[PDB]
């Protein structure tokens, strides 16, 4: 329970990794899709 709590908050903090800020977000985006029931 606590691991998922901090994990969601860590993604809240997130908002060539420096130029591709999206590159961190695709890692975040497909992280979302993996969790999805679909």
């Amino acid at each position: 329970g606590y691991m998922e709590w901090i994990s969601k908050a860590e993604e809240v903090i997130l908002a060539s990794t420096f130029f591709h800020k999206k590159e961190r977000r695709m890692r975040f985006y497909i992280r979302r899709m993996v969790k999805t029931q679909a």
């Binding site: 329970g1 606590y2 691991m3 998922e4 709590w5 901090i6 994990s7 969601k8 908050a9 860590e10 809240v12 903090i13």
Partner: protein, 324 residues
């Protein structure tokens, strides 16, 4: 008498017209006194039977002896609250019904030592502390969340960040979040009249950090008068009593892990960086745990985020409907 009835009707008309007006400010009490049983109130049957650790909301102006207030209880109607001078008078009235109050004891000593009451027997003395019956507090309670072990570290930071997000999202448009990097534990009211009033004095406290800490104390007050809920993102306070003697007296939200065993492995998940600092992160936990639960206002002792998320949610609308 027609005079008492006329001022009775005038008070009711004033109350009826003031039912829909903004609140002026709020007070904090420290004595269990009932304002419904006192016969000196302007209106009988509309008093306040409030105990200690209770909040009062004054809106309009009546006189120097009584005031119109409202309670933070849901459904609490408009009542009358004593003035701070009135309670000091009635406090002297509480202790005068006894057989003796000054130096002369009644141990079979009548007619020998009359002992007229000196300045010691009045409220002039006992001024070493002399705590006022009323304390100035924000009308709206700020909310401070105490982390599991220590703020400013990863485990606590995400442990706080998720709750901060939900406060932003669910209650958007009615809650404002303020973060203070400065300290807040040096909030004292009975130290001196004005320690370090100006920055050009070159005093020890003039150039110290007490200047901005005192300046941030009232910053909360304006946010409270705006009725929009506010929190305290203080990175220095990690224990409930550290900010309990001040005038903030805020809502303390306790998030805690059930056992120290899970917390240790919870820190392990962050990485080797927290492994350097782990040892003192456990001593800060049990010291906060050994504090009696009654000190905190709410406890989040559960592991599920959503179930904990609604736990703080349902406690907040009750605060909104309490004062509306």
């Amino acid at each position: 008498e027609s005079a008492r009835r006329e001022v009775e009707s005038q008070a009711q008309q004033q109350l009826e017209r003031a039912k829909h007006k903004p609140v002026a400010f709020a007070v904090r009490t420290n004595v269990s006194y009932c304002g419904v049983l006192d016969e000196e109130c302007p209106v009988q049957g509309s008093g306040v039977n409030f105990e200690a650790k209770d909040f009062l909301h004054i809106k309009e102006k009546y006189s120097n002896d009584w005031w119109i207030g409202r309670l933070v209880k849901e459904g609490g109607d408009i009542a009358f609250i004593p003035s701070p001078q009135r309670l000091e008078s009635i406090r002297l009235k509480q202790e005068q019904k006894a057989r003796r109050s000054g130096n002369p004891s009644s141990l079979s000593d009548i007619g020998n030592r009359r002992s007229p009451p000196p300045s010691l027997a009045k409220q002039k003395q006992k001024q070493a502390e002399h705590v006022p019956p009323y304390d100035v507090v924000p009308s709206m309670r700020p909310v401070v969340l105490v982390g599991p072990s220590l703020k400013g570290y990863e485990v606590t930071d995400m442990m706080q960040k998720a709750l901060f997000d939900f406060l932003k999202h669910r209650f958007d448009g009615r809650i404002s979040i303020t973060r203070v990097t400065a300290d807040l534990s040096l909030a004292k009211r009975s130290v001196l009249n004005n320690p370090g009033k100006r920055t050009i004095i070159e005093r020890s406290s003039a150039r110290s950090s007490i200047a901005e800490v005192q300046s941030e104390i009232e910053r909360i007050f304006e946010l409270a008068k705006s009725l929009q809920l506010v929190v305290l993102d203080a990175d220095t306070i990690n224990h409930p009593a550290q900010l309990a003697k001040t005038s903030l007296a805020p809502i303390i939200v306790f998030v805690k892990v059930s056992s120290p065993k899970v917390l240790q492995r919870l820190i392990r998940s962050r990485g080797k960086s927290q492994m350097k600092h782990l040892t003192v992160q456990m001593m800060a936990y049990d010291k906060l745990v050994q504090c009696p639960p009654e000190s905190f206002d709410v406890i989040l002792d559960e592991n599920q985020l959503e179930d904990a998320c609604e736990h703080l949610a349902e406690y907040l609308e009750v605060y909104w409907r309490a004062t509306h």
